[PDB]
Structure 1
Amino acid sequence: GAMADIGSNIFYAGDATKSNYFRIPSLLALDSGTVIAAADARYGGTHDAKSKINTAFAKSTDGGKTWGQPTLPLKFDDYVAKNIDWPRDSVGKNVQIQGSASYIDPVLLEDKETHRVFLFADMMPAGIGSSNASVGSGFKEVDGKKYLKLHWKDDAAGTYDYSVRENGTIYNDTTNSATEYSVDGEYNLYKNGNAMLCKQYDYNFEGTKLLETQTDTDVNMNVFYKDADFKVFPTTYLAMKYSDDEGETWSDLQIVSTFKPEESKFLVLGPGVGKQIANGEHAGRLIVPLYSKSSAELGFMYSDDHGNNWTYVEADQNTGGATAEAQIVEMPDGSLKTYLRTGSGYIAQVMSTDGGETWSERVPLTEIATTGYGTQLSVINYSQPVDGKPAILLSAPNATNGRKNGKIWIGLISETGNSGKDKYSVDWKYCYSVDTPQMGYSYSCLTELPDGEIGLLYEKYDSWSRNELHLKNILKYERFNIDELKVQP
C-alpha cells in the first residue's frame, strides 16, 4: 500500500469478527457525523448462503478517518466463528458449508427524527440460501393473525403444526393449546423455562473434503438451526435490529418479513443503504429496497411511523427473479429515483412521485456498460450544489465482460419543464476512474462524510468470477474530495 492506502480497510482478516473474508459493503454517515459501516463476515470463503455468515459492523467517531474494532450485531452460534483459509484449488474452491444458518447482505438506514439506526440483513435458516429456499412466507394465519410457523421434529415432513405466539409461547395449532415450549427474544428455544441446548459445529478440510462435525461446546438451540426440535420453514427471512446509541447496543431481533408473499421463493435486500425522504409531504418516510422471485422482481418496504410498521410495495410484475438490487435517491421536491441492476444487460431507472408507493416502468441507462448478470451499484444524494445544480453520485463497474473498471459518476439534476415522473433529468457530466481499467471492481457503497468529502467501501476484485473466489482483504475504503471527482475523460 501507498501512504494514501493506510487505513484503507475497516474489516480485515485477523480483526475481531474472526472472519477471513468479507463482501457486500455498507457505508453510512449519520446525522451526528459519526460514520458507520457493515459488511458480511463470510467465514466459509466468499460464497453466498448457504454458508456461515454473520453481519459485521464498525464505527468511526472522527468523520470516517479512523475505525474501531468490529462487532457482530447479527450472528448465529450453530457453527463456530473462526479464521480459516478456504481452499482456492479447482475442486475445493467450490465447496460451501452445508449446514449453517447465515445473515447476509446488509442495509443501513438512519431515522434522523428519532436518531435511530436500523440494521437489516437477509436471514437464512440452516443450509439455506436464495437458490434452495422453499416457496412460502414462513408464517401462518391463526384466526387472522400472522405467526411464525414451526415444524416439530417428530411430525411428518412439510408439516408445520406449531406457531410462535405471544410471549414467545409455542402453541399447537391443531388443538390451539400452549405447549411447554417457548422462544426468548433471540429465538432460542426453552422448555418449561429451561434453555434448550445443542452442540456447536466446527468445520475442517481434509484435502478437498469439508467435514462439518459437532464439538462438545453447547449453544442455545435456535429455531433457525439444523439440530432444533422445532424448526422454521426453510425460506428466506428479513431480519432487523435498531440502535439508539449509534451502534453501542442493539435491540431484540426482529423478523420483519411477515409480508413475504406466499408465492415468493426468496425476498431479499438490495444491499447498501436505505433512504429517509427529506422533502415533500412524506419527509421522514423510511424506505428500503428489496427484490424477489415472486409476482414481482423489484420491491420496497417503507415505514411512516419511525420503523414500527413496514409496508411492502411491488414495483413491477416480473416473475423471473432476476437480481434486481437497487439503491434510491431523492429529487429536490421529494420524488424518488431508483437505479437498479437487472438481468437484461443494463442498469435501469424507475421513478416514484408518491414517495415510493408506486413506480414507473423501467428506463435503461445507456451511459454505463455492464454484463447480463449485472452488479450492485451505489447511488447517493450530495448535500452541496455542483456547478450550481443539485447533485447525485453513482459508483459501479463499467465493463461488459467481468467486474472491473469502477467509476464514480456525478449526475446533475435539471428541471425539464414537464410534470410527473418526467419533472427532472440527470446529466452524468463527470466520470472518475477509481483505478486501471482491468482492476477488479464489484459491489460498492458511497456516503457523504460530515466534512463534505465522499467515502467509498468497495469490493476490489471480481466477486462473480469463479477464478477470484476466497480472496482476503479486498474490501477497500477510500475518500475523495468533490473536486477530485470532477473529471471529464
Structure 2
Amino acid sequence: IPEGILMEKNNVDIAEGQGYSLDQEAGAKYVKAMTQGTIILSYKSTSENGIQSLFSVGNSTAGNQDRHFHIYITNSGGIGIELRNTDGVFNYTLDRPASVRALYKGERVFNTVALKADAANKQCRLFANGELLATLDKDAFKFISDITGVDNVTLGGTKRQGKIAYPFGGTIGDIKVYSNALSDEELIQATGVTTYGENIFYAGDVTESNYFRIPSLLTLSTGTVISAADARYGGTHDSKSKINIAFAKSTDGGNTWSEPTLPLKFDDYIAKNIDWPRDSVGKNVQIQGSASYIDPVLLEDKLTKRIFLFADLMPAGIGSSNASVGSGFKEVNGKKYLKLRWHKDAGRAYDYTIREKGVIYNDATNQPTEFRVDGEYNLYQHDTNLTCKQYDYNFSGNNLIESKTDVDVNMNIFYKNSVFKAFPTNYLAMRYSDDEGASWSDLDIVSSFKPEVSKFLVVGPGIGKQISTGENAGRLLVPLYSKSSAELGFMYSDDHGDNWTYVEADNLTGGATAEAQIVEMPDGSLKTYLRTGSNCIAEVTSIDGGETWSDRVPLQGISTTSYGTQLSVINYSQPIDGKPAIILSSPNATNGRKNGKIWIGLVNDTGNTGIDKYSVEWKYSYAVDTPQMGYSYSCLAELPDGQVGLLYEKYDSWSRNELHLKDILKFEKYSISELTGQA
C-alpha cells in the first residue's frame, strides 16, 4: 500500500438510499486493505434518515451484514464509526452526540469530519468542525485489513446483504483517504474550515472548566454585552458537584469576548480541566463533598447602571434534590441571622449565629465567640484566618476518589471540613458591580426570607427585570421557584438592590421546576412565562408590580415536554409589524430537548382592563436547525445593532446519553428580518 492519498473525490451528489460506488477508483484495491489510515470528508446532509453512513468499506454479501467499517452521522447531530467483522471477532465503536449540525440560518450547511486510525499508537480518533470529539484505545488494534471478504468501497451508505443500509442523502463535498495517520494538529486545522456560531466560554479557557451550562446573556444600557454560565467542572451534573459561575463581556456588539472571570466560586475543591467518563457506569458518578454555585441570573438597574449577578449557593455536598427543609436562619432579637453548627456538637445542633460585623455568637449564652467571618464567609479565630486542605478528584476505575492535597485554602462556612458549618439547605447569593465586571462587591446572601417550611427556594436562570413605567417604575425583580407553600415566586427590590422582598405567586406545594422569565407590558404590568411540571408553558400576569399574580394559563400553540425545559423571553425595544413585541426561545419537541425555535409575540390591547388587558399573538416561529437537533437552555438579548443574540445549549441536557459533552454552549445572532421569515 503506497504512502499518502489512496483515493480522493470531489462534489459527489448522492440520492437518498442510492449511495455511490467507489469500486472503480484506481486506489480501491488499497482502500479495501488498509491496515490503518485517515479519512477526511466534507458533506452536506439533506436527509432526515436516522443513521447516515458517509463512507464505508466492507463485505456486501449474504450473511456478512456485520462485516464492515463506516463513518456515519445521525439526524440528531451525532457522529461515529463502527469497525466490524461480526461480534465474535470484533465490534469496535466510537461516537459523540451533538457533534455536527444540519441547518444554519435557514440553509443546509457543510460539516467537515475526520477519522484517524493510528496503528502505531493503537488509537482511533474522531474530529469535526475543528475539534477532537472522541478517542478509542484498543490493545488489539484492527482496521479494514481485518474485515473478512471486503468487496466494496461506498459513499452515502453501507452495503449489507446487497442493500444500502444507513442511507445518506445530500452531497459529499470532498473526501480524501490516506494510508498514513495524519497528526491531530493537521486534522483540527483541516476540519476547522467549517464552524457555525461562536463560543464565549470553552474547554481550555482560564476558567479551567471543561463543561458549561445554564446560559445568561444581557445587553447593558451602555452597549456592553455581558454573559454568565455555570462552569461545571465534574461533568455536566447539577449541584452536589463542583460548579462556579463564569462571566465574560463584549464591547464590540457581541463579536469578541473578554477572558472569562469567576465572580462566584468556592475553593474547597480544585478547579481543573478533567474528562468525565461517558460510559454507562462512570457517567452517573458526581462529586460528593464540594460546595458550589448554580443557575445564574444577570440584571441591570438602568437608573444606577449597576449590574447584579445572582445564583444558588449550595453548601458542601448539597443540591436542590437533597437540600434540608428550613431557612438556614435563626431569629434572635427579632432579626434573622445565619445559623451555624460547631463541628463537635450533635449532628443537628445549630446553636450559633453570624451577627453584626461577621461576629459568631453562642446563642445559648448570647455571648460573642472568638470566631468571626469576613465578607466572603471565611472563618477567623482571633483575627487569624483559618485554613483547611483543598480536595482533588480523580477516577480510579469507575470510582471517583476525592482526596485532600497539601494546598491550603481559607476555611469557609459552606465547606465540609469547616469547624463551623452552615445549615444544609440552599441559599440565594448575589454580588453587584459598578464597573461592568472589573470588580464585584462582597458576597450578599439575600435568602433570609426563605420559608422555614421550604426544602429549596432557587432562581429561575437567565435574566431579571426592572419595571420601566407606571407606579412601580424602578422596581427590580428576580424570578424564583420552590418546594414549599408556593412553587413560582419572586423577590423584588424598591431600593436598587439594597433590600429584597419575597412573593409567593401561587399555592402549589409540588415543587416542580417552575423556572420563569419576566416581560413588561406597555403600561408597566408584567407577564411571566414559566416551565411547569405539565405538558405546557404557563403564563401569569401581575397588575401590581409583581406583588400578586393571576392563575396559570397554558401558553396555547407552543409545544413542550412534561418534564419541561427553561425558556427565555425578552422585551424587544422596537415595534414589529407596528406592535410592541416580545421574543421567546425554547426547544419545541414534546419529548427530548430538541427542535429549538425563536418566536415573536405581538402585544395586543384587547380593550379590557386589569389582567385581561393584553393578549400576545405568537405570530412568528423560527427553527434554528432541524427537528432532531439538540436544543436546551437558552438566553436571548437584543444587541446594540438591531440583532437578537442567542446563547444556548446545542444538545439535549436532560438526556442520559448526552451528558459530559464539551463546547456545546453556542452564541448566534439573528436579524428581525431573518426571524420573521422575511429572508
TM-score norm. by structure 1 comes to 0.99
Aligned residue in 1 for 2:627: 437
CA distance in 1, matches of 2:285, 2:463: 31
1:416 counterpart (599, 603, 606): 606
2:560 counterpart (360, 370, 373): 370
Structure 1 position 292 matched with structure 2 position 462: no
2:425 counterpart (235, 239, 243): 235
Structure 1 position 458 matched with structure 2 position 640: no
2:667 counterpart (466, 477, 486): 477
CA distance in 2, matches of 1:28, 1:215: 39
Aligned residue in 1 for 2:274: 84
CA distance in 2, matches of 1:222, 1:483: 51
Per-residue CA deviation, residues 156-193 of structure 1 (Å, 9 max, x unaligned), is 11000101011100000000001100001110000000
CA distance in 2, matches of 1:296, 1:178: 37
CA distance in 1, matches of 2:279, 2:224: 42
SS in 1 for 2:245: strand
SS in 2 for 1:421: helix
SS in 1 for 2:266: coil
Per-residue CA deviation, residues 113-154 of structure 1 (Å, 9 max, x unaligned), is 011000000000000001110000000011111100000011
8 Å CA contact retained: 1:125, 1:236: yes
Structure 1 position 272 matched with structure 2 position 462: yes
Pick which of 278-287 and 113-122 moved more.
Answer: 278-287
8 Å CA contact retained: 1:430, 1:488: no
The one-letter amino acid of 1:102's match is S
2:336 counterpart (100, 125, 146): 146
Deviation at 1:6, TM superposition (A): 5.8
Aligned residue in 2 for 1:357: 547
Structure 1 position 119 matched with structure 2 position 309: yes
Per-residue CA deviation, residues 346-390 of structure 1 (Å, 9 max, x unaligned), is 100000001100100000012111111000000000001101011
CA distance in 2, matches of 1:488, 1:374: 30
CA distance in 2, matches of 1:420, 1:166: 44
CA distance in 1, matches of 2:196, 2:441: 34
8 Å CA contact retained: 2:203, 2:210: yes
CA distance in 1, matches of 2:555, 2:453: 30
8 Å CA contact retained: 2:197, 2:666: no
Which aligned runs of 4 or more in structure 1 are off by greater than 6 angstroms?
none
Deviation at 1:100, TM superposition (A): 0.1
CA distance in 1, matches of 2:506, 2:287: 34
The one-letter amino acid of 1:152's match is W
Aligned residue in 2 for 1:304: 494
2:615 counterpart (404, 411, 425): 425
Per-residue CA deviation, residues 75-130 of structure 1 (Å, 9 max, x unaligned), is 00000000000000000000000000000000000001011000000000000001
Instruction: Flag the structure with more relative contact order, 1 or 2, with Cα contacts below 8 A and sequence separation at least 6.
Output: 1
SS in 1 for 2:439: coil
Aligned residue in 2 for 1:405: 595
CA distance in 1, matches of 2:354, 2:362: 9
Structure 1 position 195 matched with structure 2 position 385: yes
Aligned residue in 2 for 1:72: 262
CA distance in 2, matches of 1:400, 1:196: 52
Deviation at 1:7, TM superposition (A): 6.0
Deviation at 1:28, TM superposition (A): 0.2
Structure 1 position 48 matched with structure 2 position 233: no
Uncovered stretches (5+) of structure 2, i.e. residues with no partner? 1-128, 130-191
The one-letter amino acid of 1:270's match is G
Deviation at 1:265, TM superposition (A): 0.1
Aligned residue in 2 for 1:220: 410
8 Å CA contact retained: 1:386, 1:412: yes
Deviation at 1:487, TM superposition (A): 2.4
Aligned residue in 2 for 1:97: 287
Aligned residue in 2 for 1:12: 202
Aligned residue in 2 for 1:313: 503
8 Å CA contact retained: 2:378, 2:412: yes
8 Å CA contact retained: 1:29, 1:35: yes
8 Å CA contact retained: 1:55, 1:74: yes
Deviation at 1:66, TM superposition (A): 1.0
How many aligned residue pairs are there? 489
Deviation at 1:8, TM superposition (A): 0.8
CA distance in 2, matches of 1:339, 1:113: 25
CA distance in 2, matches of 1:425, 1:197: 57
Structure 1 position 108 matched with structure 2 position 294: no
Structure 1 position 34 matched with structure 2 position 233: no
CA distance in 2, matches of 1:308, 1:207: 49
CA distance in 2, matches of 1:127, 1:294: 22
Per-residue CA deviation, residues 316-355 of structure 1 (Å, 9 max, x unaligned), is 0000000000001000000000000000111000000011
CA distance in 2, matches of 1:478, 1:192: 52
CA distance in 2, matches of 1:345, 1:123: 30
Structure 1 position 173 matched with structure 2 position 173: no
Aligned residue in 2 for 1:61: 251
Per-residue CA deviation, residues 243-275 of structure 1 (Å, 9 max, x unaligned), is 000111000000000000000000100000000
CA distance in 2, matches of 1:176, 1:425: 56
Greater Rg over alpha carbons, structure: 2
Aligned residue in 1 for 2:445: 255
The one-letter amino acid of 1:44's match is G
SS in 1 for 2:357: helix
Uncovered stretches (5+) of structure 1, i.e. residues with no partner? none
SS in 1 for 2:673: helix
Q: From the superposition, tell whether residues 464 and 189 of structure 1 become closer, same or farther in structure 2 (CA, over 3 Å).
A: same
The one-letter amino acid of 2:318's match is I
SS in 2 for 1:131: helix
CA distance in 2, matches of 1:273, 1:64: 17
SS in 1 for 2:201: coil
Q: From the superposition, tell whether residues 120 and 475 of structure 1 become closer, same or farther in structure 2 (CA, over 3 Å).
A: same
SS in 2 for 1:483: helix
Aligned residue in 1 for 2:513: 323
CA distance in 2, matches of 1:15, 1:7: 17
Q: From the superposition, tell whether residues 445 and 435 of structure 1 become closer, same or farther in structure 2 (CA, over 3 Å).
A: same
The one-letter amino acid of 1:419's match is T
8 Å CA contact retained: 1:431, 1:488: no
CA distance in 2, matches of 1:486, 1:395: 14
CA distance in 2, matches of 1:339, 1:367: 14
The one-letter amino acid of 1:124's match is M
8 Å CA contact retained: 1:454, 1:482: yes
Aligned residue in 1 for 2:577: 387
Deviation at 1:65, TM superposition (A): 1.2
CA distance in 1, matches of 2:271, 2:556: 43
